[PDB]
Amino acid sequence: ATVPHTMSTMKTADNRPASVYLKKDKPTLIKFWASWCPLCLSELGQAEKWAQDAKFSSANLITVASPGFLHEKKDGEFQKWYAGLNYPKLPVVTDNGGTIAQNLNISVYPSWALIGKDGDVQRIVKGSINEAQALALIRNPNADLGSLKHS
């Protein structure tokens, strides 16, 4: 199954269907993270800004937390913890057991994946990316991100 097909059986942290975020004819930029990673937590406000920014409007920007996977809080526990944080414009898909992360061989956080508009995985990046690297990826999945590492 493609990533969007898999995700279309999933809810967000507020219980709505994840599928509402997966707009057609747009690539999807996905940030994988966990509650136990303080770098990831420090970057939630950043991702929320991007998701709301017109520069990112050509892509779907979503994040995935994976209850019960890699020592993430269990299903229910995760959402209760996350409800104390305040990022109301950030989509957080909850993938119980980390199905998509396992399919994509994601083992470190944060990591990012770029899914094409046809649902195919185009790029996986281990670790953090900056706003310029994220914009470069939504424009060209084969962008050279290293040339912007020290920007």
PDB file of N, CA and C in Angstrom, residues 6-77:
ATOM      1  N   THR A   6      -2.192   3.940   3.525  1.00  0.00           N
ATOM      2  CA  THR A   6      -2.021   3.484   4.888  1.00  0.00           C
ATOM      3  C   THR A   6      -2.503   4.538   5.897  1.00  0.00           C
ATOM      4  N   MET A   7      -2.222   5.784   5.584  1.00  0.00           N
ATOM      5  CA  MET A   7      -2.526   6.839   6.533  1.00  0.00           C
ATOM      6  C   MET A   7      -4.007   7.117   6.559  1.00  0.00           C
ATOM      7  N   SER A   8      -4.692   6.741   5.494  1.00  0.00           N
ATOM      8  CA  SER A   8      -6.132   7.037   5.409  1.00  0.00           C
ATOM      9  C   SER A   8      -7.024   6.136   6.364  1.00  0.00           C
ATOM     10  N   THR A   9      -6.380   5.195   7.065  1.00  0.00           N
ATOM     11  CA  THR A   9      -7.037   4.437   8.092  1.00  0.00           C
ATOM     12  C   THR A   9      -6.696   5.001   9.488  1.00  0.00           C
ATOM     13  N   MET A  10      -6.010   6.158   9.519  1.00  0.00           N
ATOM     14  CA  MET A  10      -5.471   6.648  10.786  1.00  0.00           C
ATOM     15  C   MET A  10      -6.152   7.930  11.235  1.00  0.00           C
ATOM     16  N   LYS A  11      -6.057   8.201  12.546  1.00  0.00           N
ATOM     17  CA  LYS A  11      -6.601   9.447  13.069  1.00  0.00           C
ATOM     18  C   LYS A  11      -5.476  10.384  13.416  1.00  0.00           C
ATOM     19  N   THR A  12      -5.848  11.638  13.617  1.00  0.00           N
ATOM     20  CA  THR A  12      -4.894  12.591  14.196  1.00  0.00           C
ATOM     21  C   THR A  12      -4.971  12.583  15.714  1.00  0.00           C
ATOM     22  N   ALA A  13      -4.129  13.393  16.337  1.00  0.00           N
ATOM     23  CA  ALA A  13      -4.106  13.426  17.789  1.00  0.00           C
ATOM     24  C   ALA A  13      -5.399  13.989  18.377  1.00  0.00           C
ATOM     25  N   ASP A  14      -6.178  14.719  17.580  1.00  0.00           N
ATOM     26  CA  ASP A  14      -7.498  15.243  18.029  1.00  0.00           C
ATOM     27  C   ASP A  14      -8.661  14.368  17.592  1.00  0.00           C
ATOM     28  N   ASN A  15      -8.323  13.201  17.034  1.00  0.00           N
ATOM     29  CA  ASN A  15      -9.262  12.146  16.631  1.00  0.00           C
ATOM     30  C   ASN A  15      -9.910  12.286  15.258  1.00  0.00           C
ATOM     31  N   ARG A  16      -9.597  13.337  14.517  1.00  0.00           N
ATOM     32  CA  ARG A  16     -10.155  13.479  13.189  1.00  0.00           C
ATOM     33  C   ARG A  16      -9.423  12.546  12.217  1.00  0.00           C
ATOM     34  N   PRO A  17     -10.030  12.234  11.064  1.00  0.00           N
ATOM     35  CA  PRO A  17      -9.340  11.398  10.074  1.00  0.00           C
ATOM     36  C   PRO A  17      -8.088  12.084   9.515  1.00  0.00           C
ATOM     37  N   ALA A  18      -6.973  11.372   9.541  1.00  0.00           N
ATOM     38  CA  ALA A  18      -5.715  11.908   8.919  1.00  0.00           C
ATOM     39  C   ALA A  18      -5.938  12.229   7.439  1.00  0.00           C
ATOM     40  N   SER A  19      -6.876  11.512   6.778  1.00  0.00           N
ATOM     41  CA  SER A  19      -7.013  11.663   5.349  1.00  0.00           C
ATOM     42  C   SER A  19      -7.377  13.118   4.948  1.00  0.00           C
ATOM     43  N   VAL A  20      -7.978  13.897   5.843  1.00  0.00           N
ATOM     44  CA  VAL A  20      -8.434  15.255   5.449  1.00  0.00           C
ATOM     45  C   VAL A  20      -7.254  16.127   5.026  1.00  0.00           C
ATOM     46  N   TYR A  21      -6.070  15.794   5.543  1.00  0.00           N
ATOM     47  CA  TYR A  21      -4.874  16.624   5.285  1.00  0.00           C
ATOM     48  C   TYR A  21      -4.181  16.280   3.997  1.00  0.00           C
ATOM     49  N   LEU A  22      -4.512  15.136   3.382  1.00  0.00           N
ATOM     50  CA  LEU A  22      -3.746  14.595   2.280  1.00  0.00           C
ATOM     51  C   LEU A  22      -4.292  15.054   0.926  1.00  0.00           C
ATOM     52  N   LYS A  23      -4.327  16.372   0.759  1.00  0.00           N
ATOM     53  CA  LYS A  23      -4.964  16.991  -0.417  1.00  0.00           C
ATOM     54  C   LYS A  23      -4.412  16.461  -1.698  1.00  0.00           C
ATOM     55  N   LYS A  24      -5.306  16.330  -2.690  1.00  0.00           N
ATOM     56  CA  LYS A  24      -4.892  15.782  -3.963  1.00  0.00           C
ATOM     57  C   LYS A  24      -4.023  16.767  -4.742  1.00  0.00           C
ATOM     58  N   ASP A  25      -3.199  16.223  -5.617  1.00  0.00           N
ATOM     59  CA  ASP A  25      -2.399  16.997  -6.558  1.00  0.00           C
ATOM     60  C   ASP A  25      -1.352  17.807  -5.860  1.00  0.00           C
ATOM     61  N   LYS A  26      -1.021  17.385  -4.633  1.00  0.00           N
ATOM     62  CA  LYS A  26       0.063  18.018  -3.890  1.00  0.00           C
ATOM     63  C   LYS A  26       0.987  16.915  -3.379  1.00  0.00           C
ATOM     64  N   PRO A  27       2.294  17.187  -3.345  1.00  0.00           N
ATOM     65  CA  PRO A  27       3.174  16.236  -2.594  1.00  0.00           C
ATOM     66  C   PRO A  27       2.915  16.417  -1.093  1.00  0.00           C
ATOM     67  N   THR A  28       3.398  15.482  -0.284  1.00  0.00           N
ATOM     68  CA  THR A  28       3.232  15.549   1.148  1.00  0.00           C
ATOM     69  C   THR A  28       4.598  15.473   1.786  1.00  0.00           C
ATOM     70  N   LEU A  29       4.849  16.435   2.682  1.00  0.00           N
ATOM     71  CA  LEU A  29       6.123  16.465   3.427  1.00  0.00           C
ATOM     72  C   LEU A  29       5.773  16.045   4.832  1.00  0.00           C
ATOM     73  N   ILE A  30       6.378  14.945   5.286  1.00  0.00           N
ATOM     74  CA  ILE A  30       5.995  14.348   6.584  1.00  0.00           C
ATOM     75  C   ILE A  30       7.144  14.432   7.556  1.00  0.00           C
ATOM     76  N   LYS A  31       6.894  14.966   8.722  1.00  0.00           N
ATOM     77  CA  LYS A  31       7.926  14.980   9.806  1.00  0.00           C
ATOM     78  C   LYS A  31       7.574  13.882  10.822  1.00  0.00           C
ATOM     79  N   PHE A  32       8.506  12.943  11.036  1.00  0.00           N
ATOM     80  CA  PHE A  32       8.350  11.888  12.057  1.00  0.00           C
ATOM     81  C   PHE A  32       9.051  12.369  13.307  1.00  0.00           C
ATOM     82  N   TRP A  33       8.385  12.171  14.439  1.00  0.00           N
ATOM     83  CA  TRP A  33       8.920  12.639  15.713  1.00  0.00           C
ATOM     84  C   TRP A  33       8.402  11.806  16.876  1.00  0.00           C
ATOM     85  N   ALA A  34       8.957  12.066  18.076  1.00  0.00           N
ATOM     86  CA  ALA A  34       8.529  11.423  19.308  1.00  0.00           C
ATOM     87  C   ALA A  34       8.567  12.402  20.444  1.00  0.00           C
ATOM     88  N   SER A  35       7.717  12.113  21.420  1.00  0.00           N
ATOM     89  CA  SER A  35       7.569  12.990  22.619  1.00  0.00           C
ATOM     90  C   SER A  35       8.867  13.037  23.435  1.00  0.00           C
ATOM     91  N   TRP A  36       9.692  11.996  23.340  1.00  0.00           N
ATOM     92  CA  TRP A  36      10.890  11.909  24.174  1.00  0.00           C
ATOM     93  C   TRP A  36      12.094  12.596  23.583  1.00  0.00           C
ATOM     94  N   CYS A  37      11.929  13.218  22.401  1.00  0.00           N
ATOM     95  CA  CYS A  37      13.069  13.806  21.679  1.00  0.00           C
ATOM     96  C   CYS A  37      12.967  15.323  21.872  1.00  0.00           C
ATOM     97  N   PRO A  38      13.828  15.915  22.716  1.00  0.00           N
ATOM     98  CA  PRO A  38      13.644  17.366  22.928  1.00  0.00           C
ATOM     99  C   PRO A  38      13.928  18.206  21.682  1.00  0.00           C
ATOM    100  N   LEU A  39      14.753  17.728  20.749  1.00  0.00           N
ATOM    101  CA  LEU A  39      14.935  18.487  19.534  1.00  0.00           C
ATOM    102  C   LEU A  39      13.625  18.514  18.759  1.00  0.00           C
ATOM    103  N   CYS A  40      13.006  17.335  18.638  1.00  0.00           N
ATOM    104  CA  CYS A  40      11.707  17.302  17.996  1.00  0.00           C
ATOM    105  C   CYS A  40      10.738  18.245  18.671  1.00  0.00           C
ATOM    106  N   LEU A  41      10.651  18.210  20.018  1.00  0.00           N
ATOM    107  CA  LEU A  41       9.701  19.110  20.683  1.00  0.00           C
ATOM    108  C   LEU A  41      10.017  20.585  20.401  1.00  0.00           C
ATOM    109  N   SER A  42      11.320  20.896  20.343  1.00  0.00           N
ATOM    110  CA  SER A  42      11.723  22.315  20.092  1.00  0.00           C
ATOM    111  C   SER A  42      11.333  22.811  18.710  1.00  0.00           C
ATOM    112  N   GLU A  43      11.074  21.847  17.800  1.00  0.00           N
ATOM    113  CA  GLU A  43      10.824  22.147  16.410  1.00  0.00           C
ATOM    114  C   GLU A  43       9.307  22.113  16.076  1.00  0.00           C
ATOM    115  N   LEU A  44       8.473  21.786  17.051  1.00  0.00           N
ATOM    116  CA  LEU A  44       6.987  21.711  16.780  1.00  0.00           C
ATOM    117  C   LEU A  44       6.442  23.087  16.355  1.00  0.00           C
ATOM    118  N   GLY A  45       6.929  24.138  17.018  1.00  0.00           N
ATOM    119  CA  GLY A  45       6.435  25.504  16.653  1.00  0.00           C
ATOM    120  C   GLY A  45       6.887  25.895  15.251  1.00  0.00           C
ATOM    121  N   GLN A  46       8.106  25.504  14.894  1.00  0.00           N
ATOM    122  CA  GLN A  46       8.632  25.729  13.578  1.00  0.00           C
ATOM    123  C   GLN A  46       7.775  25.037  12.516  1.00  0.00           C
ATOM    124  N   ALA A  47       7.504  23.749  12.729  1.00  0.00           N
ATOM    125  CA  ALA A  47       6.691  23.002  11.753  1.00  0.00           C
ATOM    126  C   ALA A  47       5.286  23.590  11.645  1.00  0.00           C
ATOM    127  N   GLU A  48       4.743  24.036  12.768  1.00  0.00           N
ATOM    128  CA  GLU A  48       3.400  24.653  12.728  1.00  0.00           C
ATOM    129  C   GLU A  48       3.426  25.927  11.875  1.00  0.00           C
ATOM    130  N   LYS A  49       4.485  26.725  12.046  1.00  0.00           N
ATOM    131  CA  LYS A  49       4.639  27.938  11.213  1.00  0.00           C
ATOM    132  C   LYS A  49       4.703  27.600   9.753  1.00  0.00           C
ATOM    133  N   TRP A  50       5.496  26.586   9.410  1.00  0.00           N
ATOM    134  CA  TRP A  50       5.589  26.224   8.032  1.00  0.00           C
ATOM    135  C   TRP A  50       4.249  25.792   7.495  1.00  0.00           C
ATOM    136  N   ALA A  51       3.532  24.997   8.295  1.00  0.00           N
ATOM    137  CA  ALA A  51       2.268  24.421   7.796  1.00  0.00           C
ATOM    138  C   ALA A  51       1.282  25.539   7.473  1.00  0.00           C
ATOM    139  N   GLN A  52       1.402  26.648   8.166  1.00  0.00           N
ATOM    140  CA  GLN A  52       0.477  27.793   7.996  1.00  0.00           C
ATOM    141  C   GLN A  52       0.966  28.809   7.003  1.00  0.00           C
ATOM    142  N   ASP A  53       2.168  28.603   6.475  1.00  0.00           N
ATOM    143  CA  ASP A  53       2.816  29.624   5.628  1.00  0.00           C
ATOM    144  C   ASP A  53       2.444  29.439   4.175  1.00  0.00           C
ATOM    145  N   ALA A  54       2.145  30.557   3.492  1.00  0.00           N
ATOM    146  CA  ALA A  54       1.861  30.457   2.069  1.00  0.00           C
ATOM    147  C   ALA A  54       2.982  29.826   1.214  1.00  0.00           C
ATOM    148  N   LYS A  55       4.247  29.978   1.627  1.00  0.00           N
ATOM    149  CA  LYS A  55       5.355  29.388   0.850  1.00  0.00           C
ATOM    150  C   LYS A  55       5.244  27.867   0.763  1.00  0.00           C
ATOM    151  N   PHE A  56       4.520  27.280   1.725  1.00  0.00           N
ATOM    152  CA  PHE A  56       4.379  25.818   1.736  1.00  0.00           C
ATOM    153  C   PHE A  56       3.062  25.381   1.145  1.00  0.00           C
ATOM    154  N   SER A  57       2.303  26.319   0.563  1.00  0.00           N
ATOM    155  CA  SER A  57       0.952  25.974   0.179  1.00  0.00           C
ATOM    156  C   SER A  57       0.854  24.938  -0.933  1.00  0.00           C
ATOM    157  N   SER A  58       1.935  24.715  -1.671  1.00  0.00           N
ATOM    158  CA  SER A  58       1.895  23.740  -2.775  1.00  0.00           C
ATOM    159  C   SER A  58       1.997  22.298  -2.264  1.00  0.00           C
ATOM    160  N   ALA A  59       2.271  22.122  -0.943  1.00  0.00           N
ATOM    161  CA  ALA A  59       2.456  20.760  -0.408  1.00  0.00           C
ATOM    162  C   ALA A  59       1.545  20.576   0.769  1.00  0.00           C
ATOM    163  N   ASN A  60       1.285  19.317   1.105  1.00  0.00           N
ATOM    164  CA  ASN A  60       0.654  18.991   2.383  1.00  0.00           C
ATOM    165  C   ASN A  60       1.773  18.829   3.412  1.00  0.00           C
ATOM    166  N   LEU A  61       1.701  19.563   4.514  1.00  0.00           N
ATOM    167  CA  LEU A  61       2.696  19.359   5.580  1.00  0.00           C
ATOM    168  C   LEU A  61       1.997  18.701   6.755  1.00  0.00           C
ATOM    169  N   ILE A  62       2.495  17.510   7.082  1.00  0.00           N
ATOM    170  CA  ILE A  62       1.952  16.800   8.236  1.00  0.00           C
ATOM    171  C   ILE A  62       3.054  16.225   9.113  1.00  0.00           C
ATOM    172  N   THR A  63       2.703  15.872  10.340  1.00  0.00           N
ATOM    173  CA  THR A  63       3.692  15.203  11.195  1.00  0.00           C
ATOM    174  C   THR A  63       3.087  13.869  11.640  1.00  0.00           C
ATOM    175  N   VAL A  64       3.955  12.938  11.995  1.00  0.00           N
ATOM    176  CA  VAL A  64       3.537  11.619  12.464  1.00  0.00           C
ATOM    177  C   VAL A  64       4.235  11.310  13.784  1.00  0.00           C
ATOM    178  N   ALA A  65       3.406  11.001  14.788  1.00  0.00           N
ATOM    179  CA  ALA A  65       3.896  10.404  16.044  1.00  0.00           C
ATOM    180  C   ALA A  65       3.380   8.977  16.046  1.00  0.00           C
ATOM    181  N   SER A  66       4.121   8.096  16.713  1.00  0.00           N
ATOM    182  CA  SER A  66       3.886   6.630  16.580  1.00  0.00           C
ATOM    183  C   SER A  66       3.740   6.003  17.952  1.00  0.00           C
ATOM    184  N   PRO A  67       2.546   6.123  18.546  1.00  0.00           N
ATOM    185  CA  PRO A  67       2.360   5.564  19.911  1.00  0.00           C
ATOM    186  C   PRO A  67       2.794   4.102  20.014  1.00  0.00           C
ATOM    187  N   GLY A  68       3.535   3.785  21.072  1.00  0.00           N
ATOM    188  CA  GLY A  68       3.940   2.399  21.259  1.00  0.00           C
ATOM    189  C   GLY A  68       5.113   1.911  20.469  1.00  0.00           C
ATOM    190  N   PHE A  69       5.726   2.780  19.661  1.00  0.00           N
ATOM    191  CA  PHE A  69       6.833   2.428  18.820  1.00  0.00           C
ATOM    192  C   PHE A  69       8.049   3.210  19.298  1.00  0.00           C
ATOM    193  N   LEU A  70       9.213   2.558  19.360  1.00  0.00           N
ATOM    194  CA  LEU A  70      10.449   3.164  19.839  1.00  0.00           C
ATOM    195  C   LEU A  70      10.241   3.918  21.165  1.00  0.00           C
ATOM    196  N   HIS A  71       9.513   3.279  22.082  1.00  0.00           N
ATOM    197  CA  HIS A  71       9.275   3.783  23.447  1.00  0.00           C
ATOM    198  C   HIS A  71       8.453   5.056  23.518  1.00  0.00           C
ATOM    199  N   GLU A  72       7.775   5.379  22.396  1.00  0.00           N
ATOM    200  CA  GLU A  72       6.775   6.424  22.484  1.00  0.00           C
ATOM    201  C   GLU A  72       5.652   6.001  23.426  1.00  0.00           C
ATOM    202  N   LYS A  73       5.040   6.984  24.080  1.00  0.00           N
ATOM    203  CA  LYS A  73       3.858   6.772  24.907  1.00  0.00           C
ATOM    204  C   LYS A  73       2.830   5.931  24.180  1.00  0.00           C
ATOM    205  N   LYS A  74       2.168   5.025  24.916  1.00  0.00           N
ATOM    206  CA  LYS A  74       1.134   4.197  24.300  1.00  0.00           C
ATOM    207  C   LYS A  74      -0.064   4.970  23.780  1.00  0.00           C
ATOM    208  N   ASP A  75      -0.827   4.324  22.896  1.00  0.00           N
ATOM    209  CA  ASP A  75      -2.051   4.905  22.408  1.00  0.00           C
ATOM    210  C   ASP A  75      -2.949   5.333  23.563  1.00  0.00           C
ATOM    211  N   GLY A  76      -3.570   6.502  23.449  1.00  0.00           N
ATOM    212  CA  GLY A  76      -4.314   7.143  24.545  1.00  0.00           C
ATOM    213  C   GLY A  76      -3.415   7.999  25.444  1.00  0.00           C
ATOM    214  N   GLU A  77      -2.310   7.400  25.933  1.00  0.00           N
ATOM    215  CA  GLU A  77      -1.353   8.093  26.815  1.00  0.00           C
ATOM    216  C   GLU A  77      -0.733   9.231  25.977  1.00  0.00           C
TER     217      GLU A  77
END
